[PDB]
Amino acid sequence: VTEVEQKLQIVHQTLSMLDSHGFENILQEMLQSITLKTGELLGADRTTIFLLDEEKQELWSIVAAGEGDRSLEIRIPADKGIAGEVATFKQVVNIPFDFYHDPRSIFAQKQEKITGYRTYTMLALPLLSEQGRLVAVVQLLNKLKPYSPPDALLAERIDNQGFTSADEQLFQEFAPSIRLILESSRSFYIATQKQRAAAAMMKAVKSLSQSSLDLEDTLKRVMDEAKELMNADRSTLWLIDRDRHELWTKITQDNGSTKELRVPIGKGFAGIVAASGQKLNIPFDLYDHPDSATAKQIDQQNGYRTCSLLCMPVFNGDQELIGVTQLVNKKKTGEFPPYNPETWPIAPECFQASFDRNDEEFMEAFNIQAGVALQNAQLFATV
Amino acid sequence: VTEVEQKLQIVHQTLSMLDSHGFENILQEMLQSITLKTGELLGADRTTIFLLDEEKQELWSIVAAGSLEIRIPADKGIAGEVATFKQVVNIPFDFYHDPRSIFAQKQEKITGYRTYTMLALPLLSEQGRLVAVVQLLNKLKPYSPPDALLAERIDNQGFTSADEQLFQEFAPSIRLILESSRSFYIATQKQRAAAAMMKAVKSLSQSSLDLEDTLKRVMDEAKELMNADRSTLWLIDRDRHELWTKITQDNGSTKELRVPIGKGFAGIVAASGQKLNIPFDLYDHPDSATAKQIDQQNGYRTCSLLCMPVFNGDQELIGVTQLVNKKKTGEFPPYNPETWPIAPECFQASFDRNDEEFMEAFNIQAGVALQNAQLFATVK
Ligand SMILES: Nc1ncnc2c1ncn2[C@@H]1O[C@@H]2COP(=O)(O)O[C@H]2[C@H]1O
Ligand SMILES: Nc1ncnc2c1ncn2[C@@H]1O[C@@H]2COP(=O)(O)O[C@H]2[C@H]1O
Ligand SMILES: Nc1ncnc2c1ncn2[C@@H]1O[C@@H]2COP(=O)(O)O[C@H]2[C@H]1O
Ligand SMILES: Nc1ncnc2c1ncn2[C@@H]1O[C@@H]2COP(=O)(O)O[C@H]2[C@H]1O
């Protein structure tokens, strides 16, 4: 309560040390240099660092050796390959010559047909936090003989004895520095997210104390601000009717009309999010999505057209879902005439656009402010 | 690695929500209003919200309704009991007949307020951590004549089970204000920590300094920002059970200092793992014997000191930093060792707890350099 201003000065100093300095590049370039040196010292032809996108269940390479020292991004399902084995069970996997005689290599053999790279031997290592969380998977490919002709083909340059126990321990000279880059950035992301959530709650307290508006009008202001920042045509807060197992809301049209909408939980994108507690971001054109039947019927009834949609859950203090926000129709940049319902179901060019991952992160502060208001506005009014 | 720019834009969103809006006053005034309403509805003469300062081990009032700041040892009184055992305490009339009231009876001689009944409730998080102690005093009769004395307007049947339940209508709102602000404070400090690690990666990637000079650069920046005369990084001889460091004197000299772990402020902090902030004048402190001897040997004088632990990956101690002598702003004569033990005016100042929080970023940068500077240079 009494440290806000001082902590804001600390935030400003954090911005001074990071803003405009190209830290994504500094961090990625250093990671690349470490990986190169790690591979050189362990005698690997190629060295890859995989990260885990747990939202999409995929391992993707933040650093990965390519042909002619120009690198590409490898992306696989998090359960597949030796990389997936290391991600799941968090053991070192050492594959001796020849990897292709191992039945675990089937996935890799299919990927070779595309990449043109041939893996004979491998050392794959989990990078773990102190708690044992997966930070990354480091994969070293094709142990090399220390001396080969400079024009030698891969099959002649490989060392049939593969990677050794001494190589695995040598990797520990580098492991801490790799962890530092990956863990420092991750920790920055999480702290920034928790800081934002806390700030959004504080801002909601300020709104409720200073306003002489209803709950209804306070929630409208939050959704209208969200809509403006994200360049959405409309926005909506759906509330739960627990008794009937339904969502409801009151929309306002281009007319001067107040219409109530009601959808069963489980039906439509709002209903799906209410049932699952998990966001959905539906890109243009929403009408091509297999779950769009509900939108099609409501659009025709309202003289509107839903083309893109960001649907996110709103929670309690104790993880109970109490609402669902929607941003409706990311606006394409430019000037266009208003939508005319006589053209249905044709999508107007003005809504040929989609919400992205940035819109999702920026919307979260508005979701939190809505939730705080729903839970606390009645007590705040009494006071 | 690939989300730094997006997250920095989130930091700017956060600043736009909070900057220049007088939030310390908005939050405190709302907390005050909710406390007033809570006391009115439960019929308490007075209502207090205590917070726990963990480092000083004190309970202190952020709000009082029915106003001064009350401050007690964290283990004393009914408030202390609720902070420790985390259960509701309902005291019937008359509180003073209860042995547990002795502390309050002594506080009463000072404040002049007389407590007859009480309901003290723990406010807890999901995990069972203490957020606050809410203490309601002196249940009132629903009607008393306009100018009735306190003894005449108290209800001698005290607070009810229903009063306890009615409090839960206000508890969530109180939690919101206290927890949201706390979460912002902790997230901000953890964000600076991670930012300082990233900054170290930048420094070590673009550096041509060896380990010794890298560590000196970190400590020199630390003393510049917090206006200390000198600064020091002690390393551990984990073998002789000793600390060592190489100081540079105002002259152009190098000198090794050795302290047994356990002795001196550096040694105490190494054996315990807890920071110490020794205010002016450090020579008045019980544990200052080592500083006094070392000062005479160096022709120096230690007047204030901020001594902090430095850890590796898994929270094992790899060093101790010191900022030495917060400098008084102005222009003063150089310290002359012939004046010993007189403290010079240039060092008549102290480090505050804001310096402690800012210094953590340099502590982390030193720890990162110890573990990574040599490898980074090899790759470069
Ligand atoms: N840098 C790289 N270049 C080409 N192929 C790679 C690279 N890194 C990993 N791979 C291959 O990608 C495969 C994914 O499945 P595996 O992990 O079983 O085996 C992996 C390697 O054979
Ligand atoms: N503010 C709004 N104005 C008009 N239609 C809306 C608005 N918000 C949501 N909708 C529509 O309401 C529909 C409910 O089901 P869906 O979530 O599938 O798709 C939703 C949109 O098509
Ligand atoms: N707002 C207040 N005004 C006067 N006295 C108070 C107030 N709040 C708490 N106290 C007294 O401070 C005492 C501290 O010890 P106890 O918790 O035993 O009992 C507490 C009350 O008697
Ligand atoms: N850079 C420095 N220059 C001179 N004295 C120092 C320096 N750093 C630490 N000291 C002194 O070294 C002493 C070691 O024991 P203490 O930590 O008790 O107190 C410390 C200070 O008095």
DSSP string, A313-351: EEE-SSS-EEEEEEEEEEPPSS--PPP-GGGTTPPPGGG
Residues 6 or more apart in contact with residue B308 via CB below 8 angstroms: B269, B275, B320, B321, B322, B356, B359, B360, B363
**Nearest-ligand number for the alpha carbon of B245:** 4
Q: Which of B175, B35, B190 is nearest to A317 (CA)?
A: B175
Phi, psi (deg, nearest 5) at residue B78: -65, -35
A24, A135: one domain: yes
Helix, strand, coil percentages for chain B (3-state, nearest 5): 45, 25, 30
All residues of chain B having their beta carbon less than 8 Å from the beta carbon of residue A320 are none
Has B222 been labeled as part of a binding site? no
- Does residue A195 contact residue B187 with C-beta atoms inside 8 Å? yes
Nearest CA in chain A to B63: A1
- Residue pair B108/B95 in contact (Cβ under 8 Å)? The answer is no
Sequence-distant (6+) residues with CB within 8 A of A103 are none
The verdict on a CB contact (< 8 Å) between B371 and A180 is yes
Q: Which domain holds residue B317?
A: 194-380
Please give the structure tokens belonging to residue B28: 């405190």
Distance A365 CA to ligand 2 centre (A): 21
Beta-strand ranges (E) seen in chain B are: 44-53, 58-65, 71-73, 89-91, 118-124, 130-139, 228-237, 242-249, 253-260, 276-278, 305-311, 317-326
Whole-number Å distance between alpha carbons of B242 and B320: 12
Classify residue B349 by its DSSP letter: -
Residue A46, annotated as binding a ligand:
yes
- Residues A245, A367 within the same domain: yes
Q: Are B231 and B222 in contact (CB under 8 A)?
A: yes
b/e sequence B325-351, b meaning 16+ C-beta within 10 Å:
bbbbeeeeeebeeeeeeebbebbbbbb
How far apart are the C-alpha atoms of A294 and B290, rounded to whole Å? 78
Cβ neighbour number for residue B34 with a 10 Å cutoff: 25
Cα–Cα distance, A91 to B348 (Å, whole number): 58
Which residues line ligand 4 at a C-beta cut-off of 6 Å? B 230, 232, 247, 257, 259, 264-266, 290-291, 294-295, 298, 300, 302, 322, 324
Q: What backbone torsions phi and psi does residue A136 show, to the nearest 5 degrees?
A: -165, 170
Q: How far apart are CA B321 and CA B365, in angstroms?
A: 11
Query: How many angstroms does the Cα of residue A291 sit away from the middle of ligand 2?
Result: 13
Amino acid at B9: Q
| Same structural domain, B23 and B73 | yes
Last residue of a domain, one of A148, A164, A194: A194
Q: What tokens were used for B297?
A: 């040997």
Cα of A122 from ligand 1 centre, angstroms? 9
Among B135, B159, B193, the domain-final residue is B193
- With b for 16 or more beta-carbon neighbours within 10 A and e for fewer, the A73-108 pattern comes to ebebebebbbbbbbbeeeeebbbebebeeeeebeeb
- Give the length of chain B: 380
Write the CB contacts of A358 (distance below 8 Å, at least 6 apart in sequence): B6, B9
Query: How many other β-carbons are positioned within 10 Å of the β-carbon of residue A309?
Result: 26
B 49-68: CB under 8 A from A: 62
A50 vs B contacts (CB less than 8 Å) = none
What whole-number distance in Å separates Cα of residue A8 and Cα of residue B339? 43
B199, B118: one domain: no
How many CB atoms are closer than 10 A to CB A120?
20
Helix then strand count (H, E) for chain B reads: 11, 12
Bridge partners (DSSP) listed for residue B51: B60
Handedness of CA A66, A69, A72, A76 (dihedral sign): positive
Question: What CATH number does the domain containing B340 carry?
Answer: 3.30.450.40
The answer to whether the Cα torsion of A133, A137, A143, A148 is positive or negative is negative
Phi, psi (5° rounding) for residue B275? -70, 150
Radius of gyration of chain B (CA): 27
Task: With CA atoms as reference, report the closest residue to B235 among B249, B256, B253, B255.
Answer: B256
Q: How far is the C-alpha of B373 from the C-alpha of B380, rounded, in Å?
A: 11
Q: Judged by CB atoms within 8 Å, which residues 6-45 of A form the interface with B?
A: 6-8, 10-15, 17-19, 21, 23-24, 26-31, 33-34, 37
Token duo for residue A274: 């209410």
Gaps after residue numbers in chain B (C–N over 2.5 angstroms): 66
- Contact criterion met (CB below 8 Å) for A309 and A360: no
Burial (CB count within 10 angstroms: exposed 0-12, middle 13-18, buried 19+), residue B146: exposed
Cβ neighbour number for residue B176 with a 10 Å cutoff:
25
Say how far residue B158 (Cα) sits from the centre of its chain. Answer: 37
Task: Kindly report the protein residue whose alpha carbon is nearest to atom 5 of ligand 1.
Answer: A117
State the maximum Cα–Cα separation within chain B, in Å, rounded to a whole number. 85
Consecutive H or E run containing B225: helix B211-225
Calculate the alpha carbon distances from B211 to A197, B311, B371, B376 in Å. Answer: 40, 17, 10, 10
Asked if A113 and A15 sit in the same domain, the reply is yes
CB contact under 8 A, A23 and B189: no
Method for this entry: X-ray
Give resolution, Å, one decimal.
1.9
The last residue of one of the domains, among A130, A165, A194, is A194
Kindly report whether the peptide bond that precedes residue B229 is cis, defined as omega within 30 degrees of 0.
no
Whole-number Cα distances in Å, B161 to B88, B175, B185, B314: 11, 21, 36, 48
Q: Is B235 on the interface with A (CB under 8 A)?
A: no
Of A30, A195, A201, the CB nearest to B191: A195
Residues A126 and A250 in one domain: no
Please check whether residues A300 and A259 belong to one and the same domain. yes
Ligand 4: residue of B247, B272, B307 to mutate (most ligand atoms within 8 A of CB) is B247
Beta-carbon pairs below 8 A across chains A and B: 235
Measure CB to CB from residue A3 to each of B11, B185, B196 and give the nearest one.
Answer: B185
Give whole-number Cα distances, B263 to A20, A281, B269, B318, in Å.
46, 61, 9, 17
Is B177 an 8 Å CB contact of chain A? yes
The answer to whether residues A34 and B379 touch, using CB atoms and an 8 Å cutoff, is yes
Contacts of B1 in chain A (CB under 8 A): 24, 27-28, 31, 62, 181-182, 185
User: Collapsing DSSP states into helix, strand and coil, what is residue A305?
Assistant: coil
Residue A44 pairs with which residues in a beta bridge? Answer: A143
Does A153 share its domain with A227? no
CA distances for B309 relative to A79, B276, B277, angstroms = 42, 9, 12
Pocket of ligand 3 (CB under 6 A): B 46, 48, 64, 70, 72, 77-79, 103-104, 107, 111, 113, 115, 135, 137
Q: Mutation test of ligand 3: which of B135, B136, B138, B154 has the most ligand atoms closer than 8 Å to its C-beta? A: B135
Number of other CB atoms surrounding residue B174 within 10 Å: 22
First to last CA, chain A: 19
Binary contact (A209, B29; C-beta < 8 A): yes
Element spanning B39, H or E: helix B23-42
Q: Is the CB of A188 less than 8 angstroms away from the CB of B169?
A: no
Measured from CB, residues less than 6 Å from any atom of ligand 2 are A 234, 236, 251, 261, 263, 268-270, 294-295, 298-299, 302, 304, 306, 326, 328
Helices (H), A231-303: 268-276, 293-302
For residue B281, say if its preceding peptide bond is cis, omega within 30 degrees of 0: yes
Residue corresponding to tokens 């205590």: B50
- Nearest CA of chain B to the CA of A150: how many Å? 24
* A203 within 8 A of B18, measured Cβ to Cβ: yes
Contact A262, A268 (CB under 8 A): no
Q: Which of B188, B359, B370 to mutate to test the interface with A (most CBs of A within 10 A)?
A: B188
Is B1 in the A-facing interface, judged by CB distances under 8 Å?
A: yes
- CB nearest A185 (choices: B126, B198, B372): B198
3-state SS, A139-205, equals EEEEEECCCCCCCCCHHHHECCCCCCHHHHHHHHHCHHHHHHHHHHHHHHHHHHHHHHHHHHHHHHH
Q: What is the tally of structural domains in chain A?
A: 2
Of B62, B84, B91, B137, the residue with max ligand 3 atoms within 8 A of its CB, to mutate for a pocket test, comes to B137
| Nearby residues of A310 by Cβ (< 8 Å), 6 or more positions away | A230, A232, A279, A280, A281, A282, A326, A327, A355, A359, A360, A363
Answer yes or no: are the C-beta atoms of B346 and B335 closer than 8 Å.
Answer: yes
Q: From edge to edge, which strands make up the β-sheet containing A232-241? A: A258-264, A246-252, A232-241, A321-330, A309-315, A280-282
Using a 10 angstrom Cβ sphere, with 0-12 exposed, 13-18 middle and 19 or more buried, the burial of residue B274 is: exposed
Point out which residues pair with A314 in neighbouring strands.
Answer: A323
Mark whether A165 and A293 lie in a shared domain.
Answer: no
**What phi, psi does B293 have (nearest 5°)?**
-75, -50
Same domain, B187 and B68: yes
From A318's Cα to the closest Cα of chain B, the distance in A is: 8
Do residue A188 and residue A216 come from a single domain?
A: no
Q: B 283-342 residues with CB below 8 A of A?
A: 313-315
Measured between CA atoms, the residue of chain B closest to residue A364 is B10
> For B314, which residue in chain A has the nearest alpha carbon?
A130
Each as own residue / partner, the long-range contacts of residues B99-105 (CB below 8 Å, 24 or more positions apart, any chain) are: B103/B72, B103/B76, B103/B77, B104/B77, B104/B78
What single DSSP character describes residue B105?
A: H
Residues A39 and A150 in one domain: yes
CA dist A162 to A37, A100, A193, A294, Å?
18, 14, 44, 58
Instruction: Compute the distance between CA of residue A215 and CA of residue A208 in angstroms, rounded to an integer.
Output: 9
Residues in contact with A302: Cβ distance below 8 Å, sequence separation at least 6, in sequence order: A251, A253, A259
Which residue's alpha carbon is nearest to atom 7 within ligand 3? Answer: B48
CA of B158 to the centre of ligand 3 (A): 16
DSSP B141: P
Contact (Cβ atoms closer than 8 angstroms) between residue A208 and residue A221 = no
| Beta-carbon count within 10 A of B208 CB | 8
Chain B: closest CA distance from residue A147 (Å): 22
User: In 3-state terms, what secondary structure has residue A235?
Assistant: strand
CB of A210 within 8 Å of any CB in chain B?
A: yes
